[PDB]
Amino acid sequence: DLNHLADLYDRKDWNACKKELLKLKVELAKQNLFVPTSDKEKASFARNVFEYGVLVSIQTCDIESFARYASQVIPFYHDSLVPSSRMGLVTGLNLLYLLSENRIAEFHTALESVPDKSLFERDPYVEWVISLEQNVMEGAFDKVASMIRSCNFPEFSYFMKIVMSMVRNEIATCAEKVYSEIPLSNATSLLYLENTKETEKLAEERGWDIRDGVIYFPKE
Amino acid sequence: GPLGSMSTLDLNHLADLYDRKDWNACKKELLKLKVELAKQNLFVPTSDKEKASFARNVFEYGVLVSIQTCDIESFARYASQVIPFYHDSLVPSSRMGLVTGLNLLYLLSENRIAEFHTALESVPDKSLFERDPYVEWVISLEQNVMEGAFDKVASMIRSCNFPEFSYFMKIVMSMVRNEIATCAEKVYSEIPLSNATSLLYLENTKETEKLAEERGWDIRDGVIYFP
Numbered sequence: 001d002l003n004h005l006a007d008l009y010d011r012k013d014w015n016a017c018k019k020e021l022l023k024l025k026v027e028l029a030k031q032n033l034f035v036p037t038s039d040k041e042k043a044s045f046a047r048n049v050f051e052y053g054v055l056v057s058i059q060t061c062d063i064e065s066f067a068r069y070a071s072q073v074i075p076f077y078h079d080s081l082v083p084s085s086r087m088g089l090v091t092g093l094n095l096l097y098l099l100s101e102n103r104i105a106e107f108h109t110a111l112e113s114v115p116d117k118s119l120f121e122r123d124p125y126v127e128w129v130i131s132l133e134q135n136v137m138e139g140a141f142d143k144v145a146s147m148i149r150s151c152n153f154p155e156f157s158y159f160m161k162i163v164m165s166m167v168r169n170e171i172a173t174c175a176e177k178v179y180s181e182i183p184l185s186n187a188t189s190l191l192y193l194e195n196t197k198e199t200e201k202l203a204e205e206r207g208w209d210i211r212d213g214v215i216y217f218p219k220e
Numbered sequence: 221g222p223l224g225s226m227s228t229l230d231l232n233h234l235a236d237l238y239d240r241k242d243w244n245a246c247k248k249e250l251l252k253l254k255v256e257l258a259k260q261n262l263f264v265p266t267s268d269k270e271k272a273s274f275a276r277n278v279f280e281y282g283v284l285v286s287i288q289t290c291d292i293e294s295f296a297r298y299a300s301q302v303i304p305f306y307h308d309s310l311v312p313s314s315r316m317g318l319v320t321g322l323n324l325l326y327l328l329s330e331n332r333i334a335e336f337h338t339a340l341e342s343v344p345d346k347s348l349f350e351r352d353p354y355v356e357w358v359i360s361l362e363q364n365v366m367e368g369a370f371d372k373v374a375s376m377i378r379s380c381n382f383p384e385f386s387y388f389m390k391i392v393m394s395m396v397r398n399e400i401a402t403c404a405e406k407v408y409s410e411i412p413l414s415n416a417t418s419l420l421y422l423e424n425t426k427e428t429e430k431l432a433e434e435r436g437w438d439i440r441d442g443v444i445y446f447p
Contacts, residue, residue: 002335007339112243139406141406170406171406171407173368174404174406174407175370175403175407177370177371177400177403178400178403178404178407179407190407218370219371219428
């Protein structure tokens, strides 16, 4: 059963989790359970293995494995099993993945494909990601930044940082064109960075010169 | 002449009228010439290069006269007629670079960016991209537009040495201006009205007020406040 995997996961023993996932996947292969089956007991077990795979993959920033497990788990959801306690988080993670890769059409297709639409308000993870996507698309970057700063879902950290980097590049790209200079403090606010040293790092990355606390944007 | 042994009909009078900038006379001459093209079955390109060149030349003058008289419908019509003559083996006229550039500039001005690039892929002699001043300038313009290089676009347009491109200059500037304004909205909370006019490459304080209204900005005490 999955009690032991749950324990390993709870202790954040990711290396043991991966070894247990291998053991369980070998069992799935022996029983022909990689693809969903009408036998709900066995389908649920397989689904649950792949859910832990999604979670262990994000915890170890293994995005290749994440995307493989995500593709394996979602087909189990598009049938009639009792959702596990992980379903909202996994659904949320998959949506946020698509957002982080700017796969916006695929994101909205994924929402359309969600059997029960009430999920969008009932489940806090899915609700949060839907709101983040709306705020990004509307260019409400204050709200994006506030949502990402105050996010209470640790599992979203990896992808949220990618989203925030995309927003920050877009702001940075506008700024370097419509300013000739800006003080470091103002730029730190503008870019939703935490402090001016963070801004100094971004300035170096982008080729901006800083002199006496003022950023000068490359021109003519 | 180009149409027939004893014919007195050729392009010399149109070429005179064009250099005189007598655009109304040019239009009347173009209609005369097109009537004769119809009588001779020369609207459609023919393997007879003498005749095809004559018909092509009429349509090229049509392109040029149409843009001089601010007439985009006629311009687009004539452009659609002339380009098929280019996709065969005539010796290019002195107008071919300018016409090709105008067609490209038109597609850019309408944000028909896919068609812009298809049109470049269609140009038989791709050395034209570097050799011809008109085509080279438009290619550079479109590149700077795509990359969002606002100040380069503005500077190219401000120093353009090709009067025949004048029609499209403010149109392309408005495309870029939109983008600048979207940027300014994102990264400013306020700016003096006068600094906004300069940032946006606008002509005066009043045009900025209209743009303000159009985009929903507020102005007070000579200052713009962004939503």
